[model samples]
Target chain A: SVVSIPINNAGFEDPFIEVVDDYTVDTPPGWTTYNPNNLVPEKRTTWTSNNGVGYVGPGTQFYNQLAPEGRNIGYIYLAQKPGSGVAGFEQILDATLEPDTNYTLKVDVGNLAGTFKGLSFAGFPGYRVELLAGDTVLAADHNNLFIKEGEFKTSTVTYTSTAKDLHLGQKLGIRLVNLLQDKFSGLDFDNVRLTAEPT
Target chain B: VVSIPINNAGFEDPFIEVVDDYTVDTPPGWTTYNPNNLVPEKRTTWTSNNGVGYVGPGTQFYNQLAPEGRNIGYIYLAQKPGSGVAGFEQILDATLEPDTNYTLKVDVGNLAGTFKGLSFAGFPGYRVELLAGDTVLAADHNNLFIKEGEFKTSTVTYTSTAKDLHLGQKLGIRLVNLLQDKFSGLDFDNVRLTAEPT
Candidate 1:
């Protein structure tokens, strides 16, 4: 029987509700925002139950709908302004990979149509999902244009755990990224699941 | 293109957690109720299986596997025999545009198992409903059983009244196990809803 690797708070269903900077930022528990350079200003990213502030952006009223899974969902501002770099969410899974076992990573990715500081970026933005062993990326899938604005698309990637070195038997990690490094781009993600059996 | 934004219609999100016994539990963003209060001991009257194996020792669903995703929701009538029934409902994330025409698509089937009493005695079947609170706007009762291991698609269309649209109630869909006093079960999956300006 194939088994699913346990992902803590896989659907971002923890911490019920959170608000930051008057609804600018909300984040789910068991997940971290990727702001290594501290580029995101407060109120720029949000984790919301029903709808977040990004939906408040100009001409983006419909983006405040319910999340795909439970009440909580993660939204990140890839770039509010030029040179803002990038920001996203990542979780280090509790399960370690078995050598030579094939694993499948699945997640629902959506493009948020909103105006960034009175400017709207209403097009498909690039994103990526990665499988990592410590700092070493074992497998990755990159999308130049993941989904259309106001639409959600499912992304699936399969990779074999070939790491036999220091990273073997180590904790695996999953990361969702916004590849667009320009202005007024954001993304929403939910229902992140990873399953593995024998190859 | 008119897009219908119904999340987790396939019950694929949040994954399915396997439990020991037959309890009534619902998928994320859905609700289940046993109004009669007949089976209080079973905190959950509905069961969710991850396409793994027989739902339990003796009871089995014909299409144990999901029609589209990795999980499916099952409702059995015989196990909890009483005046009450098990039901599943979801208030959709999208609100209806007043007086618009919409079509709902759902997959329904019967589970294959040793208990054929319901099937042999003319299965009473089940019902699918679209509603505003307790008021049913549209409904379809289906007894069209396919071969045990397969599923059949059921489609129904409903128009929103000016009151329905003005109230702006979050649209909802429900599935009910209407086959009373029968030893049978029903499975549901792949629910899709689409709307257009009328």
Candidate 2:
């Protein structure tokens, strides 16, 4: 059987959503938003509501669908030059890897379409799903699926570990990234999941 | 939990009584025998009825007891100024299934000392491979750390996927002996192959 690693706020159900307003800029509760763009002090501008990020919560929106599980799917705006620093939502887990096992990292990527307040939400700005061990990239889905506007696609990253893998038994971490494409449009994400099966 | 069925698995072909030393080129039930890069004849895979130690009830080649059966397998190169490959192959009567893990184990023996002028005192590397149809799924390039006269068990693991190229192919085992030295080789005895659901 495939084993699932427990991740806090994996479904993006933290910060107590509803009435479309309860959102926090303080690391999104259990997640750590990261961006190398030193131009902004927060550094997590593209994925913060106080920054350029604004996901379809409640009280307003089109038919672009909500989160895969919860009510609020997350989004990240470019908010800088085209070649600015890359950003994402990362959550380090207490789970380590197993030898001769299959480690899978799954995340839903969206090309947010339809207007919120007369603003066009479209374009496939690319996204990435990574399964990491500290600084090492065990596996990653390199923005391969072209999700059309207003739709979400599941991105799965699979890494098979042999008994001799150097990073076996190390702590596992998940990174959901927006491959910053256009400076105006944004990328959407929701329902981040992880699993492991002995192979 | 289906296991692969291999014939002549324990190298016990052509059984002997007490003091016979008859050897054959290829063991029984094996599919093919290849003596690659050597001249004149097949130079490998001799099933020696008698082994390399003192005469006893179950005395075989080398000082240590056989890891599997009484009789043992011996492989070597014939050419003097030569280096070649000798291998034995057998097609298993098991088809690989998706989402299943296979464990393959075999004993590899490195030559230690000699009783006479036949001195094979160094390690000539060996290799063991697991194949699905024509594609080799996993291989143990037997650089295993075995002391002289010791039989080290070389192992390999393979997991088959539904979309793999050789998903439905029958499993195959290939045993290889490389003459890293001028004309010396190693020994192999036991074999164990098993599968479990993933």
Candidate 3:
């Protein structure tokens, strides 16, 4: 019997593995900062600024004026302005999404605060992820919904395999929405991850 | 020229007309009632009695609780626990929609409080009105794109010409979602009036 190499060399060291910590990879190119907004290169972790939102570190001075304390989950709370469609912070994916494959967009949304009213994992407004030969929709979790001022909740959403073309020209983006625009409370998100399996 | 009278006519004043307050008239054989949770009909008015979460009015209850009340208004608070849905306590139409043209107006603030988030103008949850024309559309003055917590106000306005709108048709104002499988927080206070042309 011939030995089978896992599809995309997908065995012990697949690049599709979940990221364990905040670190910059040469393959992906940009550094992903963790909460409190500190950056980590391959080896050197540095605190470059002290006065930004959610800044909490040795050199980082927590400004009481700029960001007043609301519910304490342990970070400076930044209140987003109403009707802001811009992504506060999002990861830009360089890999192309292949068809007929199961891709999971996972996010560890916590610090559950502020009107996270109708937060759904959408692909940048107008477009939606089509599934199953572009004939069906991956079941979306309506209860993947929660709202709080200062607690943390873990959420996992699984997207099954489907045959649909992705918008490769633009980066694949995940968006968090405020369901109740006028009456939002506050919230935080982190550890957004994506993984895929071929059908 | 001779004038022609349509129905068995003695010029019976039209069955429906815009009055200072909402008035109801059932057809000869129909019946209706205002469910306890919904507010009584009013004219050019908006009011709320928060029977859920904290007690208050306007968008304040929403602002204090959810704060993510922008394009989307409210998320149900009474977590249905074992079931992943939230329960709501309000409804607009219980029986069926009327058959007549109408003008339903709803005042909305795109961004007016602590919460700031953008939502699609015609997106499915919150602010939907089913009118007399057998049409259901998003509330008036919806923004395809809104800003963070900035107070931008608009109205959901629609006019219908259906004549059956007065035959005991129910105007639904709901926080109570119809779907039991999903979670939604539809927030609004002054669901005042549902009117037909004179």
Among these predictions, the greatest TM-score belongs to: 2
DockQ for candidate 3? 0.02
In candidate 2, what are the lDDT values of residues A142-199, reduced to their tens digit?
A: 5545465567788777766656555667799988766564423467677888888987
Candidate 3 lDDT by residue in tens digits, A60-122? 122112112221111112233323322223233445445544555543333322222564221
Which portions of model 1 miss their true places by more than 4 Å?
A17-26, A41-60, A64-66, A78-84, A114-121, A162-166, B1-198
Name the weakest run of 10 consecutive residues (lDDT summed) in model 3 chain B.
Answer: B2-11
User: Residue B176 in model 2: shift from native, Å?
Assistant: 32
Q: What TM-score would candidate 3 get against the native?
A: 0.28
* DockQ of every candidate structure: 0.01, 0.02, 0.02
**lDDT (10s digit) by residue, model 1, range B1-198:** 265766667766555455222334455666664555322434433332112212332234454455666555656554533355566677776766765777777887655555434342223245676655544455554423344555777665665434332246577888766543244456677888788775
* Displacement of the residue B90 alpha carbon in candidate 1, Å: 52
Tell me the tens digit of each residue's lDDT in model 2 across B16-108.
556325354566766433645452343324321112221225333456766776655656655432245566678888987876788888888
Question: Can you tell me the CAPRI class of model 3?
Answer: incorrect
Please rank every candidate by DockQ, starting with the best: 3, 2, 1
Between the candidate structures 1 and 2, which one is better when assessed by TM-score? 2
Best by lDDT: 2
